[PDB]
Amino acid sequence: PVDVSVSIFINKIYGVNTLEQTYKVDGYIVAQWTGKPRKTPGDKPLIVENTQIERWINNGLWVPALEFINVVGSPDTGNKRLMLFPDGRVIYNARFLGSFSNDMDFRLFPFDRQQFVLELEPFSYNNQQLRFSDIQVYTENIDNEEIDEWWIRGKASTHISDIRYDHLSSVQPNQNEFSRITVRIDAVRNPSYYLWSFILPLGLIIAASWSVFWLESFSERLQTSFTLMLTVVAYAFYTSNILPRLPYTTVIDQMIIAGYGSIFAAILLIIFAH
Amino acid sequence: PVDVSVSIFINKIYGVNTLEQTYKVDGYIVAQWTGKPRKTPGDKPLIVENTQIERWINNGLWVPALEFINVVGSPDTGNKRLMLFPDGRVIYNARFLGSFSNDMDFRLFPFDRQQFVLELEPFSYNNQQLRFSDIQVYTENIDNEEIDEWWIRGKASTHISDIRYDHLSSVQPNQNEFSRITVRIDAVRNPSYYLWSFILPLGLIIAASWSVFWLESFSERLQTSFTLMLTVVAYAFYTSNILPRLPYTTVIDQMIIAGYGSIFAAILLIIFAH
Amino acid sequence: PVDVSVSIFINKIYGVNTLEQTYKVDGYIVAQWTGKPRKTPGDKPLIVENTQIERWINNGLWVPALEFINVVGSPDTGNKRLMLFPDGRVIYNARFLGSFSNDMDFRLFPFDRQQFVLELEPFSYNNQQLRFSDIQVYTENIDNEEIDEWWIRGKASTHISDIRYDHLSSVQPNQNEFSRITVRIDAVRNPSYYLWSFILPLGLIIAASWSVFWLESFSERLQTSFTLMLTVVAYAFYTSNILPRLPYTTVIDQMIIAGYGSIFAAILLIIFAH
Amino acid sequence: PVDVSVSIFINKIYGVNTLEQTYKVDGYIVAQWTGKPRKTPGDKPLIVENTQIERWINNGLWVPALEFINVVGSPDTGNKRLMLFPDGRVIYNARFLGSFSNDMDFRLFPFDRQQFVLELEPFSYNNQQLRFSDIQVYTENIDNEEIDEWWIRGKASTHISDIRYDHLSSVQPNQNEFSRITVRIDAVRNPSYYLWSFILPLGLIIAASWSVFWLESFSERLQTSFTLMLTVVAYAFYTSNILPRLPYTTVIDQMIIAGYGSIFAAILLIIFAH
Amino acid sequence: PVDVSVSIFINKIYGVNTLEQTYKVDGYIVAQWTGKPRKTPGDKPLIVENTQIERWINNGLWVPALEFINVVGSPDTGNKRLMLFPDGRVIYNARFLGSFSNDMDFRLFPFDRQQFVLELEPFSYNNQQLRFSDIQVYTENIDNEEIDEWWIRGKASTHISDIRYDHLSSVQPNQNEFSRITVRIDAVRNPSYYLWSFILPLGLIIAASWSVFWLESFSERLQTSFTLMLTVVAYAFYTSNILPRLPYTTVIDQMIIAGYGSIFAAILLIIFAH
């Protein structure tokens, strides 16, 4: 089994779409392994850039195809480098960009602590043919940065495991477990914008809804309550465009439901009084 | 006729757009068949990855093109593997991602029970040239998962049938029936978000619309009724962006129509009283 | 002139964007012609699938490029088949998907009767080099189906004509007329959704606007009339997102204008009374 | 210098996005020049279609790359034809589709008179190596047509000029001026939809805002004025989605500002009266 | 180390999306270096256009791959020219178009002064193999232009630095520093549209909110205050669609918060008075 040393450098993390539950990671991947010795022209190592790499693969060079498990669509791979050394070591450099997905729960939606997970795996070579030696993840550009509305905390966790694929067991009986690399980056959402845009004005709405019981009337009090109902509907307008359609309720959703319940409680209270 | 054994592994199902009536399925497809024996270098089977596969096809290797019938656009095929064995068996591995479409009725829109259908078929080889032996669908990653707002129930149904194409009968008189694989995954929509976002607040609107007949007046009662009309129009705003434009009416649509009818009934009632 | 028999099979028609005045047609195209006899290996016809077709074109095989005249962008061509027969006949099978455009008038917008037109034409071969023998259009999948909000009525009309190109007359003086195939599918819009979503509620708005003259007041009547004005503006909100920006007025637009005129007529009437 | 005769045929002009200030032009381009005589098989001219053209370029054939200067993104080039004649003349036919951009001022926004400009230029050959002889633009399909909301007036202007590039002066000292073709099509916007959708209802709003001074009250007059303020805000909602963010003000924008000023003038007037 | 002289010509800067914090730069890049002397056919320099360039790279020609560091996605590279001179000098011309990103702070959002940064760097060659001699940036087309809503001030700053990559230190111990070119264009936002669209009408809202204390009542004053609350919510609707979700507050956001605070201050003031 060929031992492959991966070095994932995260250039930037952007495009975090909470509705689609996806994010875009740009960076470079450096895979290194030792193969058969070769006689390159000159004692210096020879560098193969994009396209010229194929001629070498048609000649018979072994280059693994390292795919991303949790990618959405084909990754937008840019330039590729294949640096071949006389001794035998091969260094494969490539720039990747793709949309990655995660579970991404939203129980505490303004105060999310989500993990950006990159899963890397060979497409066709199992651990009896290709083993991952180690990975160092260099998240130096975004180690402590306020990317989008997200705070990156700490370093990036690295993990190497074996994944058994039961769909490949019928075609490959004894050898179907694949070496997988998991790269986890813990991210904390910045809650400031939601704090001054949603929670505080809806709190003012709740206070104004409490303030309707100071009238010595019944009809214009009803019109006031339905004006507040229209205002709460207005606040529920641009609520579903910031978080996905979740079966559970979040803080903004419970505040909207509390506003609806407060208005309807005022309605039933004045109807019971009448 | 070459017998081809397919093994569709569904990695994830996502992007279920109810307006477009489409969904995105990501996964791998494993086609296996036995051909002529060949002398690979070494007794071990030889693995061909993306691109190097073509050289083999130019040499004269028979590799079928398994298309998706119900796909929207070209599928975003990633890496491909062609694992050739000395004996003769050929294993074709490929990763697919495309937008698939189904009939997808919405009679009970918050309580949908839709089927995600994948149809697989050879493009050019009929059942006199290529027959599908069997398919095992491995939906283990999403067997019981809350993907998007959808619940996957049970396993995946497998079916192999023959499809007669009458447009190919004029060019191929006696041999125009094609072997087709249908993969059905039954999905149940999670109704919780709609339950606390649409039905309950519109029920409060209906209760408030009932509550207008407690006024001893005529003009401000009219202004109250038109304020409620504006509120129901506001609720009809973000109604057409969650389900497609259907000839029939659904539960949210009947609740909106009931609100409109209740307000107009109040209008005609107070006009008849005056 | 080579006689080419086309057989267009319409798999589905979807994505009918009335704002862009475009629609998406998916299906297969079967072109058949007789060329020089050839000695294929074996008496059976030889099938060339995607990619391997080019090698044959580099060898010198004559394969026409049948383009779509009214397409928007490049068509998303999937798999291609080239079935070569010993005798000489060549059958060209290809799967096409593209956005097509038509004139698509909207005088009676909820009750549209539009035609989906597919125009097929060789790119480089005129009728002195390539003539279209006949076309049979097999619209069997959508012969009577409720696709989107559209009803497909009857069969598909077929037509073969010669198109003179005056821009090619300066470079080709005597031979610049091209054989063109026009495929027309008559479609009827389903008016039910608009009937229960726009016409009926706006009729209720018109009735409520008539109902303002029952007040014995002047100021709160004015406030009622401007509340109705705000409601009509709300109904004009999600009006321009369902049909394109047309110089003429349609039924929804005339209903909105009638609502505006009714409110302003009420305003001028009460001002004249005062 | 090789004299190249261009013949641009405009099939259609569509997708005029005023916000992006871009438009989509579909059509064919016919470039013709005379080169070295060649012995084609047979006295008839030989036609090279897409792909087979490259083999000829690898053989050493001189085919210029005619780029579009004002294009947005890569043009969506479809089929290409290279018609080679025994004598020597070469005719290059290609179908282009791309997003083009212009200055596109909006001083009189409902009554725009904009020019659709296509700029064509060789990428690498200057006028010491490639000169444009003439261009005839055949805008016969859209000579007098109501495309989108735009009226095409007259024919298309043709112009051939030399463009000096100062960025190529350091690498090419004496020869850096390039022959450029400018194709201008004058377009007039159809003002009918805006006339019955924006100007007339906002005029009714202005009349109703004038009508507030008929009340013998102060509080409900204030509530009426703020209802009209909410209506003008509603009309300012779907105002910024039809024209881009311009430093200057247009007719719809001045009408909105006049409505705001009229309401605030009413407010200050009644406050001064009180 | 090969000295490479770059000449970046900025054709246009457009598509400045403040929400995505990205912008689109179109233009041409001219890289020039001196290599081994060659015997071209004829004393004149030989021009290689797109595609034919590869044959030369397969022959063994050294052409660097100059990537963009801050690009979003793959750049939409169009035509490429490789002009080879007898002496030895090679001129590489290419047209690039891609989405670039910057830090792009928005402390003074209507009065932004942002920098459009283009970072250019070889993908595989370090400064021991490729050194950047100089860069001249020719921003002559947009030197003083009102592109979008942005004013370009002055010329473009040029900078050449060495970037040490610590992720390449494990694979290349002593040689991992790369020559980088930074091109900065200072841009000033045009504040006119925001000045007459947001600040002035919200100032009128603030004045009207001050004007509520002129009523001798309590209930209709409350209804007036909640009508103003609904108007401020309406103004907060189309506020989050022009600037991204920032942790800090900007001028429009502070004006919205001031309106909310003024209305709630009026509410608490009249409640304290009652």
Numbering used by the authors:
A (entry chain E), B (entry chain A), C (entry chain B), D (entry chain C), E (entry chain D): 11 to 284
Sentences from the paper on this structure:
We find that reconstituting the pentameric ligand-gated ion channel (pLGIC), Erwinia ligand-gated ion channel (ELIC), in different nanodiscs produces distinct structures by cryo-EM. ELIC is one of a few pLGICs for which there is an activated, open-channel structure, and is therefore a useful structural model. Activation and opening of the channel involves a tilting of the top of M2 away from the pore axis and partial loss of the helix, such that 16′ and 9′ turn away from the pore. In the extracellular domain (ECD), ELIC activation is characterized by a counter-clockwise rotation of the ECD relative to the TMD.
The effective diameter of ELIC, which depends partially on nanodisc size, agrees with the trend observed in the structures except spNW15ELIC. spNW15ELIC produced the largest nanodisc particle as expected for this circularized scaffold which forms 15 nm empty nanodiscs. This is evident in the mean distance between M2 Cα atoms and the pore axis, especially residues 249–251. spNW15ELIC also shows a significant tilting of the bottom of M2 towards the pore axis and the adjacent subunit, narrowing the pore at 2′ (Q233) and -2′ (E230). However, in spNW15ELIC and all other agonist-bound WT structures, the position of 9′ is unchanged forming a tight constriction of the ion permeation pathway. This is not unlike the desensitized structure of α7 nAchR where 9’ appears to form the desensitization gate; therefore, we suggest that spNW15ELIC is a plausible desensitized structure of ELIC. There is no density for M4 in spNW15ELIC indicating that this helix is structurally heterogeneous in the spNW15 nanodisc. The nanodisc density for spNW15ELIC was smaller than expected possibly because the position of ELIC within the nanodisc is more heterogeneous.
